[PDB]
Amino acid sequence: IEDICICCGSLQVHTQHPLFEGGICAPCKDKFLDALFLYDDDGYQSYCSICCSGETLLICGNPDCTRCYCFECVDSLVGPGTSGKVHAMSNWVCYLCLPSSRSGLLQRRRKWRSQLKAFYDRESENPLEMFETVPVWRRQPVRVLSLFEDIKKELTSLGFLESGSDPGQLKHVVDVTDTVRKDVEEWGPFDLVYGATPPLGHTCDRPPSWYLFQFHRLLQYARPKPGSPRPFFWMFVDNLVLNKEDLDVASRFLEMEPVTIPDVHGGSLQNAVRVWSNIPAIRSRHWALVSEEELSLLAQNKQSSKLAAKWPTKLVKNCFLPLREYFKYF
């Protein structure tokens, strides 16, 4: 079991399998790592949770479960003929959701999140600040402190907030210049801090660095109590409006590379954003082919254009997908 890899069957193993019991090979690590929490445009895990192959997927029937499996994985590990039964099942309860741990040759490790954290920390040559996943019967509703624009609709469309809910969880202030430590603490605890610059073509008398600097300040007032397992995450998205010096300043203040998320339609690029984030599996979303010249000319054409400044709600859709595995979904 331990001496034989379960991802691909190789006899050369290096450590215990992260999710379940069994072995794993070095290419199996790297392939899992490249899609450790990558999510597609459908809102679910892009690849398998074990073999990390997107060719075959098994959507879990549990409304609180998203992680899928593969036909080959279930046929080879659980046993032949189980794939058809799983596919034909109207309400399939996967393997990790239900408390049973023995199913054929597949053994479920109790408290998988601990060793997942351990392996993520022991592997990450380029790590990122991140908190342990909360179990299904211990998650809490999200608290968000929005900046400078309406942000509630994206969260409600993502299930993090409900229509008609009280404004005690989301606070939207365009004039946070007057904020005080007392004001921040009387708003209460916050788990996600979200901010962005207005879309290109919007009048802005104040310098753009405004929306950066105060954001950082609020982030520093929103840091959790030291030593708490509190899952606090933040990110900052810019619509290519800051200059290169400002980009360097933001990258240094956030201690994060500017991972961009371009949107290409029909082979042509019409809009792009730059993201500074600590969310896991966001470096895999980085695009290295984009260069400064075409994004700059597109931006200048955007100021030169008459079209109204429309905020790209679709590009930030993939940012909050992994947070489903952390917090409540309604």
Partner: protein, 440 residues
């Protein structure tokens, strides 16, 4: 929409009290009282006054009148060592019509604060004006932050050496004041980009300073591995922050960005939640900045600034804002015997200082006729002599010939000392440290 003449005309008719009307802009929304003369003064007037009260032209006189605080004309005071100026509207509207040209006729015209007479018609000088002005710059602001935590003194048997992040030290005043005060340092790393500044810091201080080059290249990881730190001081550049420049680059483009870099390092230096060390942090900046920049700085640093003027302890009118939580930053200045206070006392041999407490050190290429006399404060053996560098490095409290390094020209060390902290002010601010800290 504003008729100051109608307000003053009905006030002189014993109808409206002067204290119930603002003088700077004539607004009827009176909240406080003007610190210089009797009469009310509105909140927008306060905002404009904080931007102009101590804004001095490189020439050496107040650029704008102290009452109106901004105008396309201004009258220089004929009395030396008194920079304060008034506008023609204020003279002909408060004191009385036909008084400005009469003042111009009198060549040694004394400003309404310098003159012995305290009554000038509707305009009368408050007797206790220095105290009210000090309250104006220190005892009222737009922030209501709680007082910073105070660290109880530690026993002398367990007083460790001090670790200092001296960002933007320039001429490296911080460690010089630390050594003179008697306190020792374990490590003293500073960020600086000027070659002359780092040369002076390395030479005159026997290499105790460890430089990190440009401050934009140091991250939180370096602070984490190079700590723990106790004292963090900062002297952020004021070229783009002071309202003296026409450009007004502000706090959000130019060298003002450097400020926030400081803040970042500060959040990487203060203890997270241990509170096991008496962490101290000091920030210095000019007095003549915009109110927007003032409140942004105050709210980011989470501390109410205190005004310290080098006038009360040295011979330069270098009034500055200090943010931080050193014990008794608002304590009144102490005139120590050791440090000079008067220009004449700290003057060279065979010279007479025709001024007192000079604040003009830039030669301005002899300036013009109006620039003459002011930029020229030394009269040696019946001929004018421009300020020597030894003289101004004496007045700032620095040791004699402190900055004779790297064979700099007169102008290079001119600009080097023109942005330097005053030594006695730093001595006053760091005096409480020796109580909490080890003494060599």
């Amino acid at each position: 929409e504003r008729t100051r003449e109608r307000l003053v005309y009905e006030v002189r008719q014993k109808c409206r009290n002067i204290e119930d009307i603002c003088i700077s802009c004539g607004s009827l929304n009176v909240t406080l009282e003007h610190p210089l003369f009797v009469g009310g003064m509105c909140q927008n007037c306060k905002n404009c006054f904080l931007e102009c009260a101590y804004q001095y032209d490189d020439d050496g006189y107040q650029s704008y009148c102290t009452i109106c605080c901004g105008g396309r004309e201004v009258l220089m005071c004929g009395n030396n060592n008194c920079c304060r100026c008034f506008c023609v509207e204020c003279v002909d509207l408060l004191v009385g019509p036909g008084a400005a040209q009469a003042a111009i006729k009198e060549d040694p015209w004394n400003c309404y604060m310098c003159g012995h007479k305290g009554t000038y018609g509707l305009l009368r000088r408050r007797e206790d004006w220095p105290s009210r002005l000090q309250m104006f710059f220190a005892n009222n602001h737009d922030q209501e932050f709680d007082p910073p935590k105070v660290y109880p003194p530690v026993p002398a048997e367990k007083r460790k050496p001090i670790r200092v992040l001296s960002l933007f030290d320039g001429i490296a005043t911080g460690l010089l004041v630390l050594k003179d005060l008697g306190i020792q340092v374990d490590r003293y790393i500073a960020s600086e980009v000027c070659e002359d500044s780092i040369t002076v810091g390395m030479v005159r201080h026997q290499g105790k300073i460890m430089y990190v080059g440009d401050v934009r290249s140091v991250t939180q990881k370096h602070i984490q591995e190079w700590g723990p730190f106790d004292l963090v001081i900062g002297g952020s550049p004021c070229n783009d922050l002071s309202i003296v420049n026409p450009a007004r680059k502000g706090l959000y483009e130019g060298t003002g960005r450097l400020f926030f870099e400081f803040y970042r390092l500060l959040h990487d230096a203060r203890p997270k939640e241990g509170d096991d060390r008496p962490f101290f942090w000091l920030f210095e900046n000019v007095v003549a900045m915009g109110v927007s920049d003032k409140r942004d700085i105050s709210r980011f640093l989470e501390s109410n600034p205190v005004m310290i003027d080098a006038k009360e302890v040295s011979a330069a009118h270098r009034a500055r804002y200090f943010w931080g939580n050193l014990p008794g930053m608002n304590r009144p200045l102490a005139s120590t015997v050791n440090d000079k206070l008067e220009l004449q006392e700290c003057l060279e041999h065979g010279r007479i200082a025709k001024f007192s407490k000079v604040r003009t050190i830039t030669t301005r290429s002899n300036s013009i006729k109006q620039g003459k006399d002011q930029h020229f404060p030394v009269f040696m053996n019946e001929k004018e002599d421009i300020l020597w560098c030894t003289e101004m490095e004496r007045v700032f409290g620095f040791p004699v010939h402190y900055t004779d390094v790297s064979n700099m020209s007169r102008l290079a060390r001119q600009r080097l000392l023109g942005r330097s902290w005053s030594v006695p002010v730093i001595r006053h601010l760091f005096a409480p440290l020796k109580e909490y800290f080890a003494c060599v």
